[PDB]
Short mmCIF file of C-alpha atoms and ligand atoms in Angstrom, two decimals:
data_model
loop_
_atom_site.label_atom_id
_atom_site.label_comp_id
_atom_site.label_asym_id
_atom_site.label_seq_id
_atom_site.Cartn_x
_atom_site.Cartn_y
_atom_site.Cartn_z
CA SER A 242 -56.46 24.64 49.31
CA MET A 243 -54.11 25.26 52.25
CA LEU A 244 -52.48 28.55 53.33
CA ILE A 245 -48.73 28.44 53.87
CA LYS A 246 -46.21 31.19 54.60
CA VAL A 247 -42.98 31.45 52.64
CA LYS A 248 -40.63 33.46 54.81
CA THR A 249 -37.42 35.15 53.68
CA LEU A 250 -34.52 34.98 56.14
CA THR A 251 -34.85 38.78 56.43
CA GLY A 252 -38.27 38.11 57.92
CA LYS A 253 -40.84 38.90 55.21
CA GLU A 254 -43.71 36.42 55.05
CA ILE A 255 -45.18 35.69 51.62
CA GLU A 256 -48.60 34.06 51.88
CA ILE A 257 -49.23 31.35 49.29
CA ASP A 258 -52.30 29.17 48.77
CA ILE A 259 -51.39 25.60 47.83
CA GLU A 260 -53.09 22.31 47.11
CA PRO A 261 -51.75 19.71 49.62
CA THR A 262 -50.73 17.52 46.69
CA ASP A 263 -48.85 20.34 44.95
CA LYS A 264 -45.25 19.33 44.31
CA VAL A 265 -42.62 21.62 45.88
CA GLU A 266 -41.74 22.48 42.26
CA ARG A 267 -45.27 23.88 41.95
CA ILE A 268 -44.91 25.79 45.23
CA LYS A 269 -41.83 27.48 43.78
CA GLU A 270 -43.83 28.44 40.68
CA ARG A 271 -46.41 30.04 42.99
CA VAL A 272 -43.60 31.96 44.69
CA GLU A 273 -42.31 33.07 41.28
CA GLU A 274 -45.82 34.29 40.42
CA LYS A 275 -45.98 36.44 43.55
CA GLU A 276 -42.34 37.50 43.98
CA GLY A 277 -40.73 37.11 40.54
CA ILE A 278 -37.93 34.83 41.76
CA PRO A 279 -37.18 32.08 39.18
CA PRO A 280 -37.77 28.62 40.76
CA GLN A 281 -34.21 27.64 39.80
CA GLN A 282 -32.98 30.30 42.24
CA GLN A 283 -35.26 29.23 45.11
CA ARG A 284 -34.45 26.87 47.97
CA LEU A 285 -37.33 26.06 50.33
CA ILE A 286 -36.42 24.87 53.82
CA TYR A 287 -38.93 23.54 56.35
CA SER A 288 -37.74 23.21 59.99
CA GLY A 289 -34.13 22.94 58.72
CA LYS A 290 -34.91 20.44 55.91
CA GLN A 291 -34.11 21.33 52.29
CA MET A 292 -37.33 20.51 50.46
CA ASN A 293 -37.08 18.43 47.27
CA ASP A 294 -38.99 19.53 44.15
CA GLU A 295 -40.68 16.14 43.65
CA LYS A 296 -42.16 15.93 47.17
CA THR A 297 -45.44 17.48 48.36
CA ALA A 298 -46.14 19.55 51.47
CA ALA A 299 -47.80 16.45 52.95
CA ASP A 300 -44.49 14.58 52.54
CA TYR A 301 -43.00 17.11 54.96
CA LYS A 302 -46.00 16.92 57.32
CA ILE A 303 -46.48 20.68 56.90
CA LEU A 304 -49.66 21.96 58.52
CA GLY A 305 -51.94 24.78 57.36
CA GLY A 306 -50.53 28.19 58.29
CA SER A 307 -47.00 26.82 58.76
CA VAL A 308 -43.84 28.50 57.46
CA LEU A 309 -41.34 27.39 54.81
CA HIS A 310 -38.18 29.45 54.64
CA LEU A 311 -37.02 30.79 51.28
CA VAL A 312 -33.29 31.13 50.52
CA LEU A 313 -31.78 32.56 47.30
CA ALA A 314 -29.24 30.62 45.25
CA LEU A 315 -27.36 33.19 43.17
CA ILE B 46 -60.54 9.95 81.83
CA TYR B 47 -57.64 7.87 80.53
CA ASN B 48 -55.85 9.65 77.65
CA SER B 49 -53.12 7.75 75.74
CA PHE B 50 -52.59 10.33 73.04
CA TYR B 51 -51.46 13.95 72.86
CA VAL B 52 -51.56 16.46 70.02
CA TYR B 53 -50.40 20.01 69.61
CA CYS B 54 -53.50 22.14 69.00
CA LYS B 55 -52.38 25.29 67.21
CA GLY B 56 -56.03 26.36 66.84
CA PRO B 57 -58.10 27.61 69.83
CA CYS B 58 -55.90 25.91 72.44
CA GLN B 59 -52.28 26.81 71.53
CA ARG B 60 -50.95 23.99 73.72
CA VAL B 61 -50.31 20.25 74.04
CA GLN B 62 -53.77 18.69 74.54
CA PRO B 63 -55.15 15.13 74.89
CA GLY B 64 -55.95 13.87 71.38
CA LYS B 65 -58.88 11.85 69.99
CA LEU B 66 -57.95 9.02 67.61
CA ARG B 67 -60.32 8.27 64.74
CA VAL B 68 -60.11 5.72 61.91
CA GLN B 69 -61.61 5.62 58.44
CA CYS B 70 -61.66 3.34 55.42
CA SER B 71 -58.98 4.68 53.06
CA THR B 72 -61.21 3.81 50.06
CA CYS B 73 -64.54 5.46 50.92
CA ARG B 74 -63.13 7.75 53.66
CA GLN B 75 -65.99 6.85 56.02
CA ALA B 76 -65.77 5.69 59.64
CA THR B 77 -66.99 2.23 58.60
CA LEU B 78 -63.75 0.22 58.77
CA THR B 79 -63.67 -2.71 61.20
CA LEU B 80 -60.03 -3.52 62.01
CA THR B 81 -58.95 -7.16 62.19
CA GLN B 82 -57.06 -6.18 65.32
CA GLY B 83 -56.82 -2.73 66.88
CA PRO B 84 -53.59 -0.64 66.72
CA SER B 85 -51.05 -1.77 69.34
CA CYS B 86 -48.32 0.87 68.84
CA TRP B 87 -47.64 4.26 67.22
CA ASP B 88 -46.48 2.79 63.92
CA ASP B 89 -49.91 1.17 63.54
CA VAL B 90 -51.55 4.66 63.48
CA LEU B 91 -48.81 6.81 61.91
CA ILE B 92 -47.90 4.68 58.87
CA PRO B 93 -50.86 5.06 56.44
CA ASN B 94 -52.53 1.90 55.10
CA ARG B 95 -50.51 -0.33 57.44
CA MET B 96 -53.53 -1.84 59.14
CA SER B 97 -55.99 -4.31 57.64
CA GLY B 98 -59.76 -4.12 58.09
CA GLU B 99 -63.12 -4.82 56.45
CA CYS B 100 -65.23 -1.83 55.40
CA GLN B 101 -68.87 -2.00 56.46
CA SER B 102 -70.17 0.55 53.92
CA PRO B 103 -72.29 -1.17 51.21
CA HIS B 104 -70.20 -2.69 48.40
CA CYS B 105 -66.97 -0.91 49.44
CA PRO B 106 -63.95 -3.23 48.85
CA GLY B 107 -61.76 -1.04 51.11
CA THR B 108 -59.50 -3.07 53.41
CA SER B 109 -56.99 -0.45 54.62
CA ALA B 110 -57.26 1.96 57.56
CA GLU B 111 -56.25 5.61 57.76
CA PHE B 112 -56.08 7.17 61.24
CA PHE B 113 -56.32 10.84 62.21
CA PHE B 114 -56.12 12.75 65.49
CA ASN B 115 -58.26 15.68 66.61
CA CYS B 116 -57.81 17.88 69.68
CA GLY B 117 -59.89 16.42 72.51
CA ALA B 118 -60.57 19.77 74.19
CA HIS B 119 -63.32 21.00 71.89
CA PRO B 120 -65.96 20.05 69.31
CA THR B 121 -63.89 19.80 66.14
CA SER B 122 -64.61 18.90 62.54
CA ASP B 123 -63.23 15.56 61.34
CA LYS B 124 -61.06 17.55 58.91
CA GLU B 125 -59.79 19.90 61.64
CA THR B 126 -56.91 17.57 62.47
CA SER B 127 -54.09 18.18 64.93
CA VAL B 128 -50.59 16.80 64.86
CA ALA B 129 -50.03 13.75 67.10
CA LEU B 130 -46.92 14.05 69.26
CA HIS B 131 -46.08 10.38 69.40
CA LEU B 132 -43.25 10.68 71.99
CA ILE B 133 -45.65 12.04 74.61
CA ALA B 134 -47.24 9.56 77.04
CA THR B 135 -49.45 9.58 80.11
CA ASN B 136 -47.16 8.65 82.95
CA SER B 137 -49.04 5.41 83.73
CA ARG B 138 -45.77 3.85 85.00
CA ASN B 139 -45.00 6.66 87.48
CA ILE B 140 -41.47 7.04 86.09
CA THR B 141 -39.39 9.95 87.44
CA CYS B 142 -38.13 12.74 85.17
CA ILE B 143 -34.47 12.49 84.15
CA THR B 144 -33.83 16.15 85.03
CA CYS B 145 -36.15 17.18 87.88
CA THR B 146 -36.51 13.69 89.48
CA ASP B 147 -40.25 14.27 90.00
CA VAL B 148 -43.08 12.00 88.89
CA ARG B 149 -45.18 14.12 86.53
CA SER B 150 -47.64 13.58 83.68
CA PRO B 151 -47.56 13.85 80.71
CA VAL B 152 -43.96 12.93 79.88
CA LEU B 153 -41.91 12.66 76.71
CA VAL B 154 -40.10 9.35 76.16
CA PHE B 155 -37.00 9.59 73.95
CA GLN B 156 -36.29 6.84 71.41
CA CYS B 157 -32.81 6.09 72.79
CA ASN B 158 -31.97 2.51 73.83
CA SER B 159 -32.75 3.55 77.43
CA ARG B 160 -36.14 5.14 76.59
CA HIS B 161 -35.27 8.04 78.90
CA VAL B 162 -38.24 10.00 80.35
CA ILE B 163 -38.45 13.83 80.69
CA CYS B 164 -41.50 15.73 81.98
CA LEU B 165 -42.90 18.21 79.49
CA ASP B 166 -41.92 21.16 81.66
CA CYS B 167 -38.29 20.07 81.78
CA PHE B 168 -38.57 19.32 78.05
CA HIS B 169 -39.58 22.95 77.46
CA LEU B 170 -36.56 24.16 79.47
CA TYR B 171 -34.25 21.76 77.57
CA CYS B 172 -35.46 23.05 74.19
CA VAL B 173 -35.27 26.73 75.16
CA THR B 174 -31.72 26.50 76.55
CA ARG B 175 -30.40 24.46 73.62
CA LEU B 176 -32.09 26.81 71.13
CA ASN B 177 -30.72 30.00 72.71
CA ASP B 178 -27.25 28.45 72.90
CA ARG B 179 -27.41 27.30 69.25
CA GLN B 180 -26.93 23.69 70.35
CA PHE B 181 -29.79 22.22 68.36
CA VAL B 182 -28.49 19.58 65.95
CA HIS B 183 -28.83 20.12 62.24
CA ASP B 184 -29.18 16.84 60.35
CA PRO B 185 -29.33 16.91 56.51
CA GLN B 186 -32.15 14.32 56.44
CA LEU B 187 -34.09 14.98 59.68
CA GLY B 188 -33.73 18.76 59.81
CA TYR B 189 -33.14 20.78 62.97
CA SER B 190 -33.64 18.72 66.11
CA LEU B 191 -32.43 17.55 69.53
CA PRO B 192 -31.53 14.10 70.92
CA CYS B 193 -32.13 12.63 74.36
CA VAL B 194 -31.00 15.08 77.08
CA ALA B 195 -28.63 12.33 78.31
CA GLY B 196 -26.76 12.49 74.98
CA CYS B 197 -27.71 8.94 73.95
CA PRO B 198 -26.90 8.20 70.26
CA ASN B 199 -29.55 7.63 67.55
CA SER B 200 -32.05 9.63 69.57
CA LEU B 201 -32.74 12.75 67.48
CA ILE B 202 -36.45 13.63 67.55
CA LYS B 203 -37.89 12.79 64.11
CA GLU B 204 -41.31 14.43 64.44
CA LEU B 205 -40.28 18.08 64.53
CA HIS B 206 -43.74 19.21 65.64
CA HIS B 207 -42.65 18.16 69.14
CA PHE B 208 -40.81 21.52 69.10
CA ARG B 209 -44.21 23.20 69.27
CA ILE B 210 -43.66 22.78 73.04
CA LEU B 211 -41.53 25.92 72.69
CA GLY B 212 -44.62 28.12 72.21
CA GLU B 213 -45.41 30.05 69.04
CA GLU B 214 -42.66 32.70 69.11
CA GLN B 215 -39.88 30.35 70.25
CA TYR B 216 -41.02 27.86 67.63
CA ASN B 217 -40.70 30.58 64.97
CA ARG B 218 -37.14 31.21 66.23
CA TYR B 219 -36.56 27.41 66.09
CA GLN B 220 -37.56 27.29 62.41
CA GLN B 221 -35.51 30.44 61.70
CA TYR B 222 -32.37 29.03 63.33
CA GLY B 223 -33.01 25.75 61.48
CA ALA B 224 -33.12 27.64 58.16
CA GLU B 225 -29.84 29.44 58.96
CA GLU B 226 -28.17 26.15 59.86
CA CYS B 227 -29.49 24.54 56.70
CA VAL B 228 -28.03 27.40 54.66
CA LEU B 229 -24.62 26.93 56.31
CA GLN B 230 -24.84 23.13 55.87
CA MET B 231 -25.46 23.67 52.15
CA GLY B 232 -22.28 25.78 51.84
CA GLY B 233 -24.07 29.13 52.05
CA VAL B 234 -23.32 32.20 54.14
CA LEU B 235 -25.30 34.35 56.56
CA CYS B 236 -25.28 38.12 56.06
CA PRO B 237 -23.28 39.64 58.98
CA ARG B 238 -25.11 42.98 59.09
CA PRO B 239 -26.81 43.34 62.54
CA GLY B 240 -30.56 42.95 62.05
CA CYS B 241 -30.50 41.77 58.42
CA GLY B 242 -30.81 38.01 58.97
CA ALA B 243 -30.42 37.03 55.29
CA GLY B 244 -28.78 33.79 54.28
CA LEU B 245 -27.94 32.77 50.72
CA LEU B 246 -25.96 30.43 48.45
CA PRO B 247 -23.33 32.72 46.81
CA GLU B 248 -21.79 32.28 43.35
CA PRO B 249 -18.81 29.81 43.42
CA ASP B 250 -15.52 31.50 42.67
CA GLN B 251 -15.78 34.87 44.40
CA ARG B 252 -14.64 35.97 47.86
CA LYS B 253 -16.92 38.99 47.63
CA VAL B 254 -20.45 38.10 48.68
CA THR B 255 -23.16 40.71 48.44
CA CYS B 256 -26.45 40.35 50.34
CA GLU B 257 -28.51 40.41 47.11
CA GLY B 258 -32.29 40.50 46.74
CA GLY B 259 -34.81 43.19 45.85
CA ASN B 260 -38.13 43.75 47.67
CA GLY B 261 -36.42 43.08 51.02
CA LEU B 262 -34.71 39.72 50.32
CA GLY B 263 -31.27 41.31 50.85
CA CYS B 264 -29.65 44.47 52.27
CA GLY B 265 -26.83 44.95 49.72
CA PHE B 266 -23.96 44.62 52.23
CA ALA B 267 -20.77 43.33 50.61
CA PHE B 268 -18.72 41.06 52.84
CA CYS B 269 -15.72 38.75 52.60
CA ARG B 270 -16.92 35.16 52.63
CA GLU B 271 -13.79 34.22 54.61
CA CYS B 272 -13.77 36.59 57.61
CA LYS B 273 -17.34 37.97 57.31
CA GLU B 274 -16.13 41.58 57.67
CA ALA B 275 -16.92 44.29 55.10
CA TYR B 276 -15.42 43.20 51.77
CA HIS B 277 -11.74 44.19 51.76
CA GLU B 278 -8.65 44.08 49.56
CA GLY B 279 -5.81 41.82 50.73
CA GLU B 280 -5.45 39.23 53.50
CA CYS B 281 -8.19 39.02 56.14
CA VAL B 282 -27.42 14.41 83.55
CA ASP B 283 -27.24 12.83 87.01
CA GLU B 284 -26.37 9.15 86.57
CA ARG B 285 -28.89 7.81 89.10
CA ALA B 286 -31.62 10.16 87.87
CA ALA B 287 -31.07 8.92 84.30
CA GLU B 288 -31.14 5.29 85.51
CA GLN B 289 -34.48 5.89 87.24
CA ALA B 290 -35.95 7.74 84.27
CA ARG B 291 -36.22 4.76 81.89
CA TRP B 292 -39.70 3.92 80.56
CA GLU B 293 -39.12 0.15 80.42
CA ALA B 294 -35.96 -0.52 82.47
CA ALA B 295 -37.18 1.34 85.59
CA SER B 296 -40.73 -0.11 85.55
CA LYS B 297 -39.98 -3.71 86.47
CA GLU B 298 -40.75 -3.41 90.21
CA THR B 299 -44.44 -3.45 89.22
CA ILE B 300 -45.98 -6.62 87.75
CA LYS B 301 -47.29 -6.24 84.18
CA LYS B 302 -50.48 -8.24 83.65
CA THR B 303 -50.62 -9.83 80.16
CA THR B 304 -53.83 -11.86 80.42
CA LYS B 305 -57.32 -11.08 81.71
CA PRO B 306 -60.52 -13.20 81.71
CA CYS B 307 -63.18 -12.21 79.19
CA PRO B 308 -65.77 -10.33 81.34
CA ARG B 309 -68.57 -12.33 79.69
CA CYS B 310 -67.32 -15.90 79.31
CA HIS B 311 -64.51 -15.63 81.90
CA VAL B 312 -61.96 -17.31 79.64
CA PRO B 313 -58.44 -15.71 79.74
CA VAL B 314 -57.48 -13.53 76.75
CA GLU B 315 -53.92 -12.43 75.97
CA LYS B 316 -53.28 -8.71 75.49
CA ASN B 317 -51.71 -7.76 72.16
CA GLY B 318 -48.83 -5.42 73.00
CA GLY B 319 -50.17 -1.99 73.98
CA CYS B 320 -53.61 -2.49 72.40
CA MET B 321 -56.51 -1.86 74.82
CA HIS B 322 -59.15 -3.38 72.51
CA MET B 323 -59.67 -6.97 73.63
CA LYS B 324 -61.58 -9.44 71.45
CA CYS B 325 -62.76 -12.70 72.99
CA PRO B 326 -61.93 -15.53 70.49
CA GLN B 327 -64.58 -17.86 71.94
CA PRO B 328 -67.00 -18.29 68.98
CA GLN B 329 -70.18 -18.24 71.09
CA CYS B 330 -68.99 -15.17 73.03
CA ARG B 331 -66.94 -12.75 70.91
CA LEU B 332 -67.24 -9.96 73.50
CA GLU B 333 -65.10 -6.94 72.71
CA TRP B 334 -63.98 -5.00 75.79
CA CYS B 335 -61.48 -2.37 76.99
CA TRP B 336 -58.48 -3.78 78.89
CA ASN B 337 -58.18 -0.52 80.82
CA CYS B 338 -61.78 0.28 81.70
CA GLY B 339 -63.32 -3.23 81.72
CA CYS B 340 -66.40 -2.01 79.80
CA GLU B 341 -67.80 -3.20 76.49
CA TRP B 342 -65.71 -1.78 73.65
CA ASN B 343 -66.99 1.60 72.44
CA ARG B 344 -65.87 4.72 70.57
CA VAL B 345 -64.85 6.66 73.68
CA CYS B 346 -62.23 4.04 74.63
CA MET B 347 -61.29 3.92 70.93
CA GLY B 348 -60.76 7.68 70.65
CA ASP B 349 -59.08 8.15 74.04
CA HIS B 350 -56.89 5.05 74.45
CA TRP B 351 -57.12 2.50 71.62
CA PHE B 352 -53.54 1.63 72.58
CA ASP B 353 -50.92 2.94 74.97
CA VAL B 354 -47.14 2.66 75.37
ZN1 ZN C 671 -57.65 22.36 70.83
ZN1 ZN C 672 -64.94 1.80 52.62
ZN1 ZN C 673 -38.84 17.23 84.92
ZN1 ZN C 674 -31.45 8.59 76.48
ZN1 ZN C 675 -27.93 41.50 54.53
ZN1 ZN C 676 -11.72 38.62 54.76
ZN1 ZN C 677 -65.74 -14.31 76.05
ZN1 ZN C 678 -61.43 2.16 78.01
#
């Protein structure tokens, strides 16, 4: 697996372990598991790009230890 | 040593380093794939399964290459990869920097029509100033980036890892600012409380936005989405320097050799684009040799400079 950080805009890093083939949808489920935020309410942004649920981390060229930002959709 | 390739090593090095190119069979994942022709350009190594070869491992029908880069500075594992920064070149053409006017190496070559050249030190300064001034460009498809310093169109950097030139903390600020801009692009709002930093997509038909989120996601400040105050009742480059700094257009005073005799049989062989791996087509010869070094082809030339720009 690969370690990524999911960082709130307020600056909290949430460490998540992912498989590099995990869909972004699956990443959100992992975030739900740790933080209790329903995936429907999550937006993940990597270097300014809104990440689509059907893509993988590898689609976004994300490296181990890199940061995806998490934004709430109320 | 001639190095064609650069990576960002975020591991021991924490800097732009010369990279080592390796190739494997995409079927068996072993370094047993003989390419029909070597890579001649970045697309050849960045677009997976683009290149044809024959695998030498017993009974493997693999015919497609996958390339990887490792940092060249240290013994690495094959799986300890680094990101290739494909805009960065060794300044083999001695082209001056668009901003400082000095000949330096390495350089970054933008993908504008002019192929404008900036030294990496000036590139760092460009990124830092644009970042601090909030003049990075947010693009809904490409993310948060910058174009050619000259302002040339269609020149936004696509491989965002180039921004690792900022250094770790500035790069973190880069990604943070990119997230904020993405939020705003998406029709969201940024919390205006000093030091909060939250951004969110508020509910549709309400002027009152609250910075929601337990466990630190929000701060609970209620603001007006119009004026961003507390929620309230009622109404609220040098022209010549740029010319000289062109990777192709400013290199024509120097003759470009396109053909060299095979060192063994002495018969002229045509170079294929930027590929350094020369293969003599004479059936009784078939010498493979490095255009750059002149030596028999080998893995050092492969790893260091299989092709160049
Ligand atoms: Zn390194
Ligand atoms: Zn194979
Ligand atoms: Zn410069
Ligand atoms: Zn340009
Ligand atoms: Zn707030
Ligand atoms: Zn107002
Ligand atoms: Zn020959
Ligand atoms: Zn060589």
